[PDB]
Design a protein around this ligand. Structure first.
Ligand SMILES: C[C@@H]1O[C@@H](O)[C@@H](O)[C@H](O)[C@@H]1O
Ligand SMILES: C[C@@H]1O[C@@H](O)[C@@H](O)[C@H](O)[C@@H]1O
Ligand SMILES: C[C@@H]1O[C@@H](O)[C@@H](O)[C@H](O)[C@@H]1O
Ligand SMILES: C[C@@H]1O[C@@H](O)[C@@H](O)[C@H](O)[C@@H]1O
Ligand SMILES: [Ca+2]
Ligand SMILES: [Ca+2]
Ligand SMILES: [Ca+2]
Ligand SMILES: [Ca+2]
Ligand SMILES: [Ca+2]
Ligand SMILES: [Ca+2]
Ligand SMILES: [Ca+2]
Ligand SMILES: [Ca+2]
Lengths: 114, 114, 114, 114
């Protein structure tokens, strides 16, 4: 099934934050309405926050996360969780190798902000 | 129901990261086995990261997040989500006022690392 | 924070299913637009499906679950999870005593159907 | 990523319940320790419960859900959610066709019981 694609409230600010846990340098791309809106990169095996940014979901609300290492797309896993019918987290894990820890780049999207 | 309390696997490193979305200064305390292990403080209405750290869950695996604003405890909401039976997120929102956006401090705990 | 309240897309069929795990007889009421639309009762310590039903969210999309034991309201916990940006689960646990297993009545709402 | 595989606490009773939402007959196999422990089947486009059972996670705690329709395994999506650090849901959706509603068989695993 498609992973890393989320429908957010239209025209709404959201936070996107990426963490690295791999020997490989991670590159995380965030697409809003199918166009790159943010790119983060780094290399850590200790959960470095390689990027954090506030974006707007735009007219369509479509947000997609992609992750690659050495130009090869990582396999993604994702889900969205809503607390007290209001607080939202869109979650992404990714795997760049063979151990299946899926933490090589971890991405958290949160809204609402403010 | 109690919120903000999570049982992690014993002796496991985890990341904890806090974001702020409120006019009030947020104080986030992270307890491991009932003792303070990290404290973050900051003010933002733009989802700023007010702290990030890597901790060890210790022998008990018990991790608790508490949030207060100028000494007043915030009401919390939380849940844990596991993707592909491997990647864990323990999520906390908090409310310091009357609007019930529950994002006034947002805390994300993730494991495994590495 | 408020628990057991979910906003579904309007005029949408959804499933609601209740399970019992307690010495006490559980009464589960499912409200749509603040009016009871389904009720289930029963006792089990072995997860009996005390009821399942297909309901329509109606014009408001507001769905609330309430649980009581011989008229005494149980404490609720809840969250919503979305898989592959399309499959929704609204989840409720409830506690009628002191042990905090929160499984005394468990309610699962799922959509879309068909 | 692997989906529909969950590690439960060892020797723990859990509920498993399946719903159908498709033109095709769903066969759901529930494996414990890599051996079939339960099989449910049925056809519904109205979320009928096609099976429910209490099982034991056994010494390894490994539980897997597989879904087949028209002689072929369906594509699965899954996640585990934990409420108030106590109540566990392991959730599975499945797609037997081309519409990507992922509800064709929906499987809910819950623990603890009792
Ligand atoms: C240090 C290692 O680097 C990679 O090979 C990752 O895929 C592993 O998960 C681990 O983080
Ligand atoms: C700017 C405002 O500050 C507080 O009153 C918060 O409780 C509100 O949610 C909002 O963030
Ligand atoms: C048999 C017991 O019945 C009640 O006291 C429940 O609150 C307990 O969780 C347990 O199920
Ligand atoms: C009635 C239809 O039956 C199948 O084709 C399913 O894959 C569809 O999702 C729909 O439920
Ligand atoms: Ca890896
Ligand atoms: Ca890794
Ligand atoms: Ca607030
Ligand atoms: Ca706020
Ligand atoms: Ca109880
Ligand atoms: Ca119980
Ligand atoms: Ca389908
Ligand atoms: Ca279907």
């Amino acid at each position: 099934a498609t992973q890393g694609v989320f429908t957010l409230p239209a025209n709404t600010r959201f936070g996107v934050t990426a963490f690295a846990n791999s020997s490989g340098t991670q590159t995380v791309n965030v697409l809003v309405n199918n166009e790159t809106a943010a790119t983060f990169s780094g290399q850590s095996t200790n959960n470095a926050v390689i990027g954090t940014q506030v974006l707007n979901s735009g007219s369509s609300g479509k947000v997609q996360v992609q992750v690659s290492v050495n130009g090869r797309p990582s396999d993604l896993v994702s889900a969205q969780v809503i607390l007290t019918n209001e607080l939202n987290f869109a979650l992404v894990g990714s795997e760049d190798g063979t151990d299946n820890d899926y933490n090589d780049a971890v991405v958290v999207i949160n809204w609402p902000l403010g």
